[PDB]
Amino acid sequence: PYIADCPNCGHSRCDSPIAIEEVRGDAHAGVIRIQTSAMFGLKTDGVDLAYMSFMNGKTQKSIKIDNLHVRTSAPCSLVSHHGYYILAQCPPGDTVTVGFHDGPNRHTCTVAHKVEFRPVGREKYRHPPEHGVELPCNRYTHKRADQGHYVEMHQPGLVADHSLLSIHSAKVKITVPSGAQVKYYCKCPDVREGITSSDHTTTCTDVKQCRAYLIDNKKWVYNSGRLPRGEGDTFKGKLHVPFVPVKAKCIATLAPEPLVEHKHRTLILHLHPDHPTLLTTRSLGSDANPTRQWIERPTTVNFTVTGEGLEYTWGNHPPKRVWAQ
Amino acid sequence: KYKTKVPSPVVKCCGATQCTSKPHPDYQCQVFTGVYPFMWGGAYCFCDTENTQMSEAYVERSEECSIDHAKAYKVHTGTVQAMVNITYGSVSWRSADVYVNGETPAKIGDAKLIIGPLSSAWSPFDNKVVVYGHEVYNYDFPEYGTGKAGSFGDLQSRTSTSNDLYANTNLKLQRPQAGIVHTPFTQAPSGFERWK
Amino acid sequence: QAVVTQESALTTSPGETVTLTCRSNIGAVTSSNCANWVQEKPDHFFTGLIGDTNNRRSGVPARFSGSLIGDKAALTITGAQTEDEAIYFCALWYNNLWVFGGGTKLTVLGQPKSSPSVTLFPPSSEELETNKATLVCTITDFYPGVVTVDWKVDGTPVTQGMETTQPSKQSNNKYMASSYLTLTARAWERHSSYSCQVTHEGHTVEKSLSR
Amino acid sequence: QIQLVQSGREVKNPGETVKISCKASGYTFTEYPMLWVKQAPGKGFRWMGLIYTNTGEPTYAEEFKGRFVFSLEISASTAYLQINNLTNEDTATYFCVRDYFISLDYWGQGTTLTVSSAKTTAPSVYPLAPVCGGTTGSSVTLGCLVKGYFPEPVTLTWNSGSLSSGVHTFPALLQSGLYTLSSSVTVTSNTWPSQTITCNVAHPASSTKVDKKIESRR
């Protein structure tokens, strides 16, 4: 579970494990795929997707997911998590605002991202309905058995941990997690690399002038922009994405039927939608003479139909056609 | 639409790290100094101006590029077709797919039939066309290799597999603020975002 | 290369709340040390109580809870019980290995005293056929677990020949011990009155045989 | 549910090797690796390392890198400790343990090793019946004395193990270079000598098995 710098972490820029990168309000189904720097899913070892492992300290905390909250302008709905990554059904929102509850603390993370949800169709809803026609939307999956893409996930760079740099009663005293690789020296001249167990520091004294580092590359990370490079190498760790964008047919929009009214080679149409509906036509002469107008306000319109025919498209309701001799 | 899939910046703690122009599409990279990067322990690099930060970001096809993607074409005239039914005579049936070029038969059923060429050569497609899912746009797409950032075709990949592309996105990195690790990428949202 | 330290012994009474602590020599204990608490009952009987600071193993009574208090890991027994009398060990993780504390012996008031059950057996005859005789004195079910065993051949305190084991904890949490007095087939046949005297929480119990 | 049952306790002269088994029950072996802990007679508890029961890679504590070797009969849910070129100061008890829940949740029974030079002496098993006269109470205590054997261990049961309630088996103790053990059993006065009560003793090191029925002295 990677940890990075959340931008407006409740107060201001903290370093949250759930630091939000790559917000994708690019689908249609009320859904956003998000990456936390935290890797929830199974535990550290082997069990139960519905548990929760973020970083506390240098360490993980692979425990229950109890009170996740993604949210935006309104509280979102989770869809599924896998890896670093969560899918959640959100409404539109100027921002994105994520957070669980460990239990002692709220411990959330928030971010800017322009979000919208147009459904696919000539109706510009704000939200998916219960009914209407199905038609080919873009949307992310529920599932994990997924390989359609993979993002590079090589090592972490080092990280700071000044909990290490204690004092040896006059000298600044570094320690190690588990024998991990601590990269160490101070502004003064003393040990210059640091690949060690718990060292002391002969020369410097102040904690604030030393290299508290953790080369702990036993587990790779996501290659966040808010990661410091592991300077050594491009290690392996090519790793999939679960939530591929797929060609789901969203349960989708439908605009109320029109009121057809006859006139001489002319369609008066008293019209009354639910939401802004893009109407348009095609006078089937080799003179096309089409028309487009989003209609949200109910409006009686007109169409000079010709002899050979016109067609009529009340939103994603199917196209009509008309003989006006 | 692009995805500014930022590679994680370098932070050298005391002195410079010259960047090189890697061959990634629109590989924008700019060295930066004068940081003090707060990373989980306050700052970590002990210098104060020699703290160096090298930001790098390249453009890459979205995952939606595979599936939700506009598609340009140079469109010529080709050859028109039809599933002509004839419930002929007393034969009463043939529903056959045919051509228009005026020497093609199609002996499906029992009758041999030659069609066209039609006189009405209006291809409703223009020469240049963009295509999107089902909505087809007879648009003068600028070209591969040229599309102005923000305008349509800021990202221009030959196909989905094609690792090479043209990404005029005007991607300009800026220095991160007040000694904190992050990557200001200042960029036009795509000409595929608009165009929708 | 880290030293976990724990209280040596703590005494409480049934119904009280008692806290055991676990200190690390390198610094404050934190959640990344995943403090574990293990209990050792007599008979080399180990069970895990808490893990990852505050996760209670399944089937461990709720009177047990773990936490970090100050800069150390703590185990609180809320409503200590007589059954909780045992040795509690803490373990701390240090990035690559585990370090165990010295353990805290906890004593909880309870288990009303119980007198020993003493039995003295004569040398069997198959053994007298070896030119040897061993009088076995068995003492079981006594609590507190401390006794004094004194042998007396013919009225006279034997002082050489005897061996008394150390009190061993039985399952019910009472103790046992046996004492042996080895004579020779011959020493056997000589003297005439053997007696195993056991002194426990002030009362004495004498079990005598007559050859 | 989870039972880690360990091998019985061995005796070995300096220089020898020992393989201590840990047979796991109740969990899926593969998702939980094994901790090997040494509780030395005085000293307290010490982590010897951990074995990834999935890949098979062992970690040794630095104190244990060398003569110690962890391995596993995966197939049978067994983990094993092998201590080669036994040093006399390796006498202690070794526990296997399951690593789970950010710590250790279950511990085994322990296998105690006593590194010690000595030949092989079979035990003499002696019945302990009550005094020749009377012995009239609501119950009755019989015994069994397992004298003069080497090395450890011996096992002792009563009536093939069907009589376990009211039994006190007393830890073996070294006296004049040999181990001596004893056990008592208490039953209602109606049971004995009406029904047969038998002491069962095994000494693996000498391939000695003795069944001794407790008989009345007259």
Coordinates of N, CA and C in Angstrom, one line a residue, chain C residues 55-134:
Chain C
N55 N -5.5 -7.2 18.0 CA -6.4 -8.2 17.4 C -6.5 -9.3 18.4
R56 N -7.6 -9.6 19.0 CA -7.7 -10.8 19.9 C -7.8 -12.1 19.1
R57 N -7.0 -13.1 19.4 CA -7.1 -14.4 18.7 C -8.5 -14.9 18.9
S58 N -9.0 -15.8 18.2 CA -10.4 -16.2 18.3 C -10.4 -17.2 19.4
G59 N -11.4 -17.1 20.3 CA -11.6 -17.9 21.5 C -10.9 -17.5 22.7
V60 N -10.4 -16.3 22.8 CA -9.7 -15.7 23.9 C -10.7 -14.8 24.5
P61 N -11.0 -14.9 25.8 CA -12.0 -14.2 26.5 C -11.8 -12.7 26.2
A62 N -12.8 -11.9 26.2 CA -12.9 -10.5 26.0 C -12.3 -9.7 27.1
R63 N -12.0 -10.2 28.3 CA -11.4 -9.6 29.4 C -10.0 -9.2 29.0
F64 N -9.5 -9.7 27.9 CA -8.2 -9.4 27.3 C -8.3 -8.5 26.1
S65 N -7.5 -7.4 26.3 CA -7.4 -6.4 25.2 C -6.0 -5.8 25.1
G66 N -5.5 -5.4 24.0 CA -4.2 -4.9 23.8 C -4.3 -3.5 23.4
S67 N -3.2 -2.8 23.5 CA -3.2 -1.4 23.0 C -1.8 -0.8 23.2
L68 N -1.7 0.4 22.8 CA -0.4 1.1 23.0 C -0.7 2.2 24.0
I69 N 0.1 2.2 25.0 CA -0.1 3.2 26.1 C 1.2 3.9 26.2
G70 N 1.2 5.2 25.9 CA 2.5 5.9 25.9 C 3.4 5.3 24.8
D71 N 4.6 5.0 25.1 CA 5.5 4.4 24.1 C 5.6 2.9 24.2
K72 N 4.6 2.3 24.8 CA 4.8 0.8 24.9 C 3.5 0.1 24.6
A73 N 3.7 -1.2 24.3 CA 2.4 -2.1 24.0 C 1.9 -2.5 25.4
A74 N 0.6 -2.6 25.6 CA 0.1 -3.0 26.9 C -1.0 -4.1 26.7
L75 N -1.2 -4.9 27.7 CA -2.2 -6.0 27.6 C -3.1 -5.7 28.9
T76 N -4.4 -5.5 28.8 CA -5.1 -5.3 30.0 C -6.1 -6.5 30.2
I77 N -6.1 -7.0 31.4 CA -7.0 -8.0 31.8 C -8.1 -7.3 32.6
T78 N -9.3 -7.2 32.1 CA -10.3 -6.5 32.8 C -11.3 -7.5 33.5
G79 N -11.0 -7.7 34.8 CA -11.8 -8.7 35.6 C -10.9 -9.9 35.6
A80 N -9.6 -9.7 36.1 CA -8.7 -10.9 36.0 C -9.4 -12.0 36.7
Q81 N -9.2 -13.2 36.3 CA -9.7 -14.5 36.9 C -8.5 -15.3 37.3
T82 N -8.8 -16.2 38.2 CA -7.9 -17.2 38.8 C -7.2 -18.0 37.7
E83 N -7.9 -18.2 36.6 CA -7.5 -19.0 35.5 C -6.4 -18.2 34.7
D84 N -6.3 -16.9 34.9 CA -5.3 -16.1 34.2 C -4.0 -16.2 34.8
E85 N -3.8 -17.0 35.8 CA -2.4 -17.0 36.5 C -1.5 -17.7 35.6
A86 N -0.6 -17.1 35.0 CA 0.4 -17.7 34.0 C 1.5 -16.7 33.7
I87 N 2.3 -17.1 32.7 CA 3.4 -16.3 32.2 C 2.9 -15.7 30.9
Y88 N 3.0 -14.4 30.7 CA 2.6 -13.6 29.5 C 3.8 -13.1 28.9
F89 N 4.0 -13.3 27.6 CA 5.2 -12.9 26.9 C 4.8 -11.9 25.8
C90 N 5.5 -10.9 25.5 CA 5.1 -10.0 24.4 C 6.2 -10.2 23.4
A91 N 5.8 -9.9 22.1 CA 6.7 -10.1 21.0 C 6.5 -8.8 20.2
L92 N 7.6 -8.3 19.6 CA 7.6 -7.1 18.8 C 8.3 -7.4 17.5
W93 N 7.8 -6.9 16.4 CA 8.4 -7.1 15.1 C 9.3 -5.9 14.8
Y94 N 10.5 -6.3 14.2 CA 11.5 -5.3 13.8 C 12.0 -5.3 12.4
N95 N 11.1 -5.1 11.5 CA 11.3 -5.1 10.0 C 11.8 -6.4 9.4
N96 N 12.4 -7.3 10.2 CA 12.9 -8.6 9.6 C 12.9 -9.8 10.6
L97 N 12.8 -9.5 11.9 CA 12.8 -10.6 12.9 C 11.9 -10.2 14.0
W98 N 11.6 -11.2 14.9 CA 10.8 -11.1 16.1 C 11.7 -11.1 17.3
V99 N 11.4 -10.3 18.3 CA 12.1 -10.3 19.6 C 11.0 -10.5 20.6
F100 N 11.2 -11.4 21.5 CA 10.3 -11.8 22.6 C 10.8 -11.1 23.8
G101 N 9.9 -10.8 24.7 CA 10.2 -10.1 26.0 C 10.5 -11.3 27.0
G102 N 10.9 -11.0 28.2 CA 11.3 -12.0 29.2 C 10.1 -12.7 29.8
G103 N 8.9 -12.2 29.6 CA 7.7 -12.6 30.1 C 7.4 -12.1 31.5
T104 N 6.1 -11.9 31.8 CA 5.7 -11.4 33.1 C 4.9 -12.6 33.9
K105 N 5.4 -13.0 35.0 CA 4.6 -14.0 35.8 C 3.5 -13.3 36.5
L106 N 2.2 -13.6 36.1 CA 1.1 -13.0 36.8 C 0.4 -14.0 37.7
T107 N 0.2 -13.6 38.9 CA -0.5 -14.4 40.0 C -1.9 -13.8 40.3
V108 N -2.9 -14.6 40.2 CA -4.3 -14.1 40.5 C -4.9 -14.8 41.6
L109 N -5.4 -14.0 42.6 CA -6.1 -14.6 43.8 C -7.2 -15.6 43.4
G110 N -7.3 -16.7 44.1 CA -8.3 -17.7 43.8 C -7.9 -19.1 44.2
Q111 N -8.5 -20.1 43.6 CA -8.2 -21.5 43.9 C -8.0 -21.7 45.4
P112 N -9.2 -22.0 46.1 CA -8.9 -22.2 47.6 C -7.9 -23.3 47.8
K113 N -7.1 -23.1 48.9 CA -6.0 -24.0 49.2 C -6.6 -25.5 49.1
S114 N -5.7 -26.4 48.9 CA -6.0 -27.9 48.8 C -4.9 -28.7 49.5
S115 N -5.2 -29.6 50.3 CA -4.2 -30.4 51.0 C -3.7 -31.4 50.1
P116 N -2.5 -31.9 50.3 CA -1.9 -32.9 49.5 C -2.6 -34.3 49.8
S117 N -2.5 -35.1 48.8 CA -2.9 -36.5 48.8 C -1.6 -37.3 48.6
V118 N -1.2 -37.8 49.7 CA 0.0 -38.6 50.0 C -0.3 -40.1 50.0
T119 N 0.6 -40.9 49.4 CA 0.6 -42.3 49.3 C 2.1 -42.8 49.3
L120 N 2.3 -43.8 50.1 CA 3.6 -44.4 50.2 C 3.5 -45.9 49.8
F121 N 4.3 -46.3 48.9 CA 4.3 -47.6 48.4 C 5.6 -48.3 48.9
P122 N 5.5 -49.6 49.1 CA 6.6 -50.5 49.5 C 7.3 -50.9 48.3
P123 N 8.6 -51.3 48.5 CA 9.4 -51.8 47.3 C 8.6 -53.0 46.8
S124 N 8.4 -53.1 45.5 CA 7.7 -54.3 45.0 C 8.6 -55.5 45.2
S125 N 8.1 -56.7 45.1 CA 8.9 -57.9 45.3 C 9.8 -58.2 44.1
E126 N 9.4 -57.9 42.9 CA 10.2 -58.2 41.7 C 11.5 -57.4 41.8
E127 N 11.4 -56.3 42.5 CA 12.5 -55.3 42.7 C 13.3 -55.8 43.9
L128 N 12.7 -56.6 44.8 CA 13.5 -57.1 45.9 C 14.3 -58.3 45.5
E129 N 14.0 -58.6 44.3 CA 14.7 -59.8 43.6 C 15.9 -59.3 42.8
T130 N 16.1 -58.0 42.9 CA 17.2 -57.3 42.3 C 18.2 -56.9 43.3
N131 N 17.8 -57.1 44.6 CA 18.7 -56.8 45.7 C 18.6 -55.2 46.0
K132 N 17.4 -54.7 45.6 CA 17.1 -53.3 45.7 C 15.6 -53.1 46.2
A133 N 15.4 -52.0 46.9 CA 14.2 -51.6 47.5 C 14.0 -50.1 47.4
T134 N 12.9 -49.6 46.8 CA 12.6 -48.2 46.7 C 11.2 -47.9 47.1

